[PDB]
């Protein structure tokens, strides 16, 4: 490695010594990617081993299995596990790829050349350069677009994806007409984030998701092609800072925002995160409890469970009035043009809807760090914390910390570009050249 | 020159009594609107139906409250998470009855504090100094955002936010302890530790520096080393001041994160019925008395 | 003089009225220096308008020499606003007097210190001698790289 | 008092660490910090003695007032209710 005297960075800033070493940085990045896929494979195998297919996927603390299920592997209608082999093959494949990536990372980190500028001009960059960076960005944008189009291809020309809005419960459907209309796709972006409008978290049908992925894949491929053959415009040069720490700052800010968005989507959305796998959302649990009480007392005109909305729709009464924007596959059939349909609430309630509502009622998203499901005043009876709560909390924390990272690194990047990272000049400081404050 | 030129020179001018950067352009009107509406509502505002059951709660000064009990009631429960501007209410009276001022004040105040955090960096860059005071300020603003914004999002209603008052703050804290075991949570423990350590280190640093006065950092370091057996730490003043900055900031970050996690119903430790006996007879512990207090608070908190 | 007591209070870090007079003196001194630089620039331009190119060049060079150190502009300039235009005038005046290498070096310094108006450089006639040296175009493309790589895209479209 | 003490600790640490000189004489510029806090907040410290004595003074006063309050509670002398509100 290197010491403090020859670099100026202490041990607790050791990685900062790799800014000007291309090969070392590449090796470190590859090793970290190997770590990521190692965790993916190991966790997949661990969750596969500790899996009881008879019970729902959310009663036991599974996180990656819901993902592989909603991709549509080994899932029958209603969420039953047909088989558990694809999960195993995914885990082992990720583990082997991790071994490969780790070997590459260690090799590039401590065998290969420190700087790739001389021997290999193609894989040679200087942060100050403004064209090679765009080339790299274009290559990686092409990779991301290829990944998105791979998802679309899987959902359109393979076994398909688990559509949870299929009649009679969710089922593995093959999308045959994704919505490519630009208006409906970008309406999600231009949508409000308050109340009934949930921004991109409000997406419901799988057709819109697939169409949006088509749009994003083609846009990313075109953007990569553009960036490979282009140099930033003069205003872009004047507005940004061109150094490694600045690029890291931009990435940190973007990834923190994405972490917040993922937290919100995991907590609220229930289509890309089907309730059969991740469990019911909080609003879903409350609405299901209200519906279950209503039907139980009906089989025993509002029926002491209905109420008028602030805008004038039939909604479930009680405190559940706050969760009156919820839409679910087991509740939409009973919905009418103006709120709930009284005639449909009185008849045509299939047993599967009642069973699903009862199941969701007892598994509301409540829990504790001690892993004791229920309210904070309840005794130790059952251990259950919903995967939705874990995902939301973890990714909110990560998003906040990465936003703090953007703040720190952007400040340091601007200071270093201006030449303030060391300190005050001690001979000609700006304050001594200023009129005294009145 | 163009009028835009003179306007830009005045805005970015560093000769003003209070610096108003490009961030300040948004900070000033937002904070001014927030404080104006807060003052007007606190002095005089009709009772707010905080629960949406036609049982209004009064918090204004002209409706009976003194300074301690006065507050700006958070918006109604019928609104939920809906955006409630002054121009979507049926009437101004209806807007007042549903607690719109709370939403207006909280939105403008959050925008103002974010722009203030930006302005700190802007003036730090202008003067030629290292820009990390904004990072230190990021802890109270994060705590305020978690109190006012993230918790309503997790709970699904703005009516769960902190009331803009004193007795409202106490009620929010008691109800929160009832619903979530705030005290028996590691992140609140680190928050308390951070606050107590901040006070302790502030007192210690102040005393040492004001006692080492000449008519001597070495003398203070020697005294401290002879006192608490710490002979190999805090020899460098820069490291000492960095530790002073780091401790409370990290504590507040962690307590804000704990608040945000509880917003998604992830409470603290629940050591109820943990200690048992042969033949399965429960033996009580202190956590059981804490549970009894929480049960009383939760039972009395509800209204129907 | 008062610098001694300003240093004395600085060694303790108590601010006070000792720093205030030094601060005011520095502020007024820099203001009058900037005014003197502006009037020297005007005089140099006036003398350049009727030949006398060497005198104008000397005056502009003296203007460059009297540059504040560690300048921080209100808009984060890090350089005096007159500095870039005086550097460009150095480049122009030298270019009209042959010695193309140092002229393009001064132009490079001017573009480093700002002066984003690259079009003026291309359309300028006084820099015609600089057009002879390809190093002018080299420095220009180092400081103005055309956005579209036309040759690569044409080659790819060909195959 | 306790919250103000925590605030003072954070402000002092961040301000000293962000006004250092590049490397008897002080290790940071008091003038720059004073200018920054005068143009940001409105008021700023100008004397090191006063700043560090304030840091000392705040928490001690807060804790002493808390102790007086607890002494009052020891005799059930409480600030419990407002008779007009009741």
């Amino acid at each position: 490695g290197r010491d403090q005297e020859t670099t100026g960075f202490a041990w607790w800033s050791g990685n900062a010594r790799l800014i000007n070493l291309s090969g070392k940085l590449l090796g470190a990045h590859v090793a970290h990617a190997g770590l990521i896929v190692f965790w993916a494979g190991a966790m997949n195998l661990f969750e596969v081993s500790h899996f009881v297919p008879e019970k729902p996927m959310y009663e036991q603390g599974l996180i990656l299995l819901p993902h592989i299920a909603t991709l549509g592997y080994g899932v029958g209608p209603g969420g039953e596990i047909i088989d558990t082999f694809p999960y195993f093959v995914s885990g082992v494949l990720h583990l082997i790829s991790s071994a490969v990536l780790g070997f590459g990372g260690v090799y590039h980190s401590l065998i290969g050349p420190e700087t790739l500028e001389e021997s290999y001009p193609f894989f040679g960059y200087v942060w100050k350069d403004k064209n090679k960076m765009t080339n790299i960005l274009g290559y990686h944008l092409i990779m991301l677009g290829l990944g998105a189009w791979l998802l679309v291809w899987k959902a359109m020309y393979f076994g398909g994806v688990y559509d949870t809005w299929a009649p009679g419960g969710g089922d593995v459907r093959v999308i045959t007409n994704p919505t490519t209309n630009a208006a409906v796709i970008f309406g999600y972006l231009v949508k409000s984030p308050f109340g009934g409008d949930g921004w991109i978290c409000s997406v419901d049908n799988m057709e819109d998701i697939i169409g949006g992925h088509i749009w994003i894949g083609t846009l990313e491929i075109l953007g990569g092609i553009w960036h490979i053959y282009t140099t930033p415009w003069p205003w872009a040069r004047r507005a940004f800072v061109w150094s490694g720490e600045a690029y890291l700052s931009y990435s940190l800010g973007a990834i923190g925002v994405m972490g917040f968005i993922a937290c919100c989507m995991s907590w609220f959305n229930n289509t890309a995160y089907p309730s059969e796998f991740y469990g019911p959302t909080g609003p879903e649990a409350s609405q299901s409890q209200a519906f279950t009480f209503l039907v139980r007392d009906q089989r025993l005109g509002l029926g002491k469970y209905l109420m008028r909305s602030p805008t004038g729709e039939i909604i479930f009464g009680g405190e559940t009035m706050r969760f009156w924007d919820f839409r679910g596959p087991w509740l939409e059939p009973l919905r009418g043009p103006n709120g709930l349909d009284l005639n449909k609430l009185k008849n045509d309630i299939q047993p599967w809807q009642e069973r699903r509502a009862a199941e969701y009622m007892t598994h509301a998203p409540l829990g504790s760090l001690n892993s004791v499901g229920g309210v904070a005043t309840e005794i130790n009876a059952v251990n259950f914390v919903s995967p939705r709560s874990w995902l939301a909390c973890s990714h909110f924390c990560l998003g906040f910390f990465f936003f703090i990272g953007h703040l720190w690194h952007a400040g340091r990047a601007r200071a270093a570009a201006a030449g303030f990272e060391k300190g005050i000049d001690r001979f000609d400081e700006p304050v001594l050249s200023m009129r005294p404050l009145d | 020159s163009s009028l835009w030129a003179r306007f830009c020179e005045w805005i970015t001018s560093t000769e003003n009594r209070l610096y108003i950067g490009w961030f300040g352009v948004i900070m000033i009107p937002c904070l001014l609107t927030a404080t104006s509406v807060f003052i007007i509502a606190f002095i005089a505002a009709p009772p707010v139906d905080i629960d949406g059951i036609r049982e209004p709660v009064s918090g204004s000064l002209l409706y009976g409250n003194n300074i301690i009990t006065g507050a700006v009631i958070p918006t109604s429960n019928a609104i939920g998470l809906h955006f409630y501007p002054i121009w979507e209410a049926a009437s101004l009276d209806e807007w007042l009855y549903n607690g719109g001022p709370y939403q207006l004040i909280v939105c403008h105040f959050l925008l103002g504090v974010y722009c203030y955090m930006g302005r700190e960096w802007e003036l730090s860059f202008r003067l030629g100094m290292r820009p990390w005071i904004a990072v230190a300020y990021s802890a109270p603003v994060a705590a305020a955002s978690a109190v006012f914004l993230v918790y309503p999002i997790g709970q699904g209603s703005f009516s769960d936010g902190m009331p803009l008052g004193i007795s409202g703050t106490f009620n929010f804290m008691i109800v929160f302890q009832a619903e979530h075991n705030i005290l028996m949570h590691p992140f609140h423990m680190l928050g308390v530790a951070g606050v107590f350590g901040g006070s302790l280190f502030s007192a210690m640093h102040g005393s040492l520096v004001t006692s080492s006065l000449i008519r001597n950092i070495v003398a203070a370091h020697g005294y401290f080393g002879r006192l608490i057996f710490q002979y190999a730490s805090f020899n460098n003043s820069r490291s000492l001041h960095f530790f002073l900055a780091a401790w409370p900031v990290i504590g507040i970050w962690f307590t804000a994160l704990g608040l945000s996690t509880m917003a998604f119903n992830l409470n603290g430790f629940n050591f109820n019925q943990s200690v048992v006996d042969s033949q399965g007879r429960v033996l009580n512990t202190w956590a059981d008395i804490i549970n009894r207090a929480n049960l009383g608070m939760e039972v009395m908190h509800e209204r129907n | 003089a008062a610098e001694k007591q300003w240093k004395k209070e600085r060694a303790g870090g108590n601010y006070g009225a000792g720093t205030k007079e030094i601060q005011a003196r520095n502020y007024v001194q820099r203001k009058e220096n900037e005014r003197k630089r502006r009037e020297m620039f005007d005089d140099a331009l006036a003398k350049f308008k009727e030949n006398d190119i060497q005198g104008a060049l000397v005056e502009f060079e003296n203007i460059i020499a009297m540059e504040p150190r560690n300048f921080v502009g209100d808009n984060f300039s890090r350089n005096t606003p007159i500095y870039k235009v005086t550097q460009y005038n150095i480049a122009c005046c030298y270019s009209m007097l042959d010695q193309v290498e140092e002229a393009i070096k001064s132009l490079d310094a001017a573009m480093l210190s700002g002066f984003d108006n690259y079009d003026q450089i291309r359309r300028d006639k006084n820099l015609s001698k600089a057009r002879a040296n390809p190093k002018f175009q080299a420095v220009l493309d180092k400081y103005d790289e055309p956005v579209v790589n036309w040759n690569a895209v044409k080659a790819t479209f060909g195959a | 008092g306790v919250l103000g003490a925590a605030l003072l600790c954070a402000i002092h640490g961040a301000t000293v660490e962000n006004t250092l000189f590049e490397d008897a004489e002080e290790t940071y510029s008091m003038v720059t910090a004073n200018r920054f806090w005068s143009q940001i907040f409105g008021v700023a410290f100008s004397n090191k003695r006063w700043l560090h004595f304030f840091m000392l003074l705040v928490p001690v006063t807060g804790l002493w007032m808390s102790a007086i309050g607890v002494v009052g509670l020891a005799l059930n002398l409480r600030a419990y209710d407002f008779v007009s509100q009741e």
């Binding site: 005294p436 009145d438 | 009594r17 002095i43 000064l61 002209l62 003194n66 300074i67 | 601010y15 006070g16 009225a17 720093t19 205030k20 | 409105g42 008021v43 100008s46």
Partner: peptide, 27 residues
């Protein structure tokens, strides 16, 4: 008139803050 005296005290505090900000003595 309790609200009146409360408001007067608060406005007095705000005025003291404003005067301290804008009418501070020079160093």
């Amino acid at each position: 008139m309790e609200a009146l005296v409360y408001t007067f005290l608060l406005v007095g505090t705000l005025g003291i803050i404003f005067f301290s900000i804008f009418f501070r003595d020079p160093p």
